Design a protein around this ligand. Structure first.
Ligand SMILES: NC[C@H]1CCC[C@@H](CNc2ccc(C(N)=O)cn2)C1
Ligand SMILES: NC[C@H]1CCC[C@@H](CNc2ccc(C(N)=O)cn2)C1
Lengths: 242, 242
């Protein structure tokens, strides 16, 4: 290919439903990243590692209780095959609600890895000793439970892929407006039609500060605001208080 | 169908990439919920609402700056068509990093709705006046940015679908173990082979409390622990301190 590839990422995926990953590899910005060789996603399915007639991928938990776990042998063999394909330096990630909570800073840390292997749990998850022996890091995409680790893995791939050069402040987005000039009686703020680029930049920043303060004030606590940001935030708070 | 349907959910989706949703509708537990008529996902693509030769779905932002926005007319017409199909009572949700942060409690609130319409933003998102006029609630799946609202929408569908009867404490999961009895020298905790159901329940609960304290102690602050939980947590903390 001709598209500059230097920072490309390889992501191995272990999943019982590899076809789910077409949602990222066949469409959109991520699909383009795959076609241009900026991103490669390679999947291994534990089902292909079973030897019994029925291709059994689940197993009963010690101690009983409801639920099944992923069967150790097919999952372990799939992980080992993915690790051999990756060569040296691949970090193996398991997605689960018990993992470190993902945020944009963590996305940018993960995007530093040229190789990742993402293990997608189903059922009640994977045997704890496999976490100990095969998993480098455990991450959660949020505090909620899904039917498998595939959507979390897809979410992580998409988030990290945005930080790969060529694929494409700590505050919420400012409001954005497009045509038409009047929509259900609502008008575009005149500043955005002014052509004054500095006034527009400051208005957008002030709106982002105001929205972050009103919706997610804890996000402001994590920032050391610039002098300009402190002033625009004070102005917004004064206006909000009238 | 014969599968009991009483609590079924209908989810309309507005997306430029409706085929991404096959990942949920064709596979796994969610795929089964669709086949059994517990969950219906119906998609409308703004591209089908364009009238120009090139089927234009993006538009330039007022005030310039980088990025495009979703074009208002095709998106608005798609939303209106979805609302007409839904009939009365559909809550219209826009997924974005500026929305209320999703957690399991919020999932269970959302699962009370028999009808949802999920609007998937691409580019720099949707015109603010469309949020004002067409959107009931804005939600985020986590503090990170993706290339579109499709994966967030899929994540929300899967999370809510688990609370639909028939599809399938505030603490992290306890460790789980399956065969074999010894794995890379690591043994299953003897209690889980004891056959003593009460001792197993208490061990699992104590482990969940210990893991939550060590990994996500802020989660314990949100709970009013039961008497039994307070005792097992104190025991775990004492053991951790030796
Ligand atoms: N006890 C349920 C749990 C057992 C272990 C496997 C998971 C798979 N599903 C997931 C995975 C990850 C996330 C997340 N928040 O990152 C949510 N859901 C389900
Ligand atoms: N400025 C970027 C932003 C513009 C507006 C549309 C979104 C689409 N992508 C999303 C959507 C939702 C989430 C989430 N955390 O729920 C993340 N990513 C992108």
């Amino acid at each position: 290919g001709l598209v500059p590839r230097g920072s490309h990422m390889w992501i191995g995926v272990i999943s019982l439903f590899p076809e789910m990953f077409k949602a990222i590899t066949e469409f959109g910005v991520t699909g383009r990243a795959v076609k241009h060789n900026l991103l490669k996603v390679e999947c291994w399915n534990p089902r292909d590692f079973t030897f019994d007639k029925h291709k059994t991928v689940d197993d009963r938990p010690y101690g009983g209780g409801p639920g099944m776990l992923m069967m150790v042998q097919p999952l372990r063999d799939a992980i080992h095959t993915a690790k051999a394909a990756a060569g040296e330096g691949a970090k193996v990630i398991y997605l689960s609600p018990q993992g470190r909570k993902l945020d944009q800073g963590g996305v940018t840390e993960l995007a530093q890895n040229q190789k990742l292997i993402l293990v997608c749990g189903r059922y009640e998850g994977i045997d704890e000793r496999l976490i100990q022996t095969e998993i480098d890091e455990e991450w959660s995409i949020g505090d909620y439970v899904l039917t498998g680790g595939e959507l979390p893995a897809m979410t992580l791939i998409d988030a990290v892929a945005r930080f790969i050069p060529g694929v494409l402040d700590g505050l919420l987005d400012c409001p954005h407006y497009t045509r038409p000039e009047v929509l259900e009686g609502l008008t575009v703020p005149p500043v955005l039609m002014s052509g004054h680029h500095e006034e527009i930049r400051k208005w957008r920043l002030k709106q982002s500060l105001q929205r972050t303060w009103l919706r997610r004030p804890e996000l402001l606590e994590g920032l050391a605001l610039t002098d300009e940001q402190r002033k625009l935030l004070k102005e917004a708070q004064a206006e909000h208080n009238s």
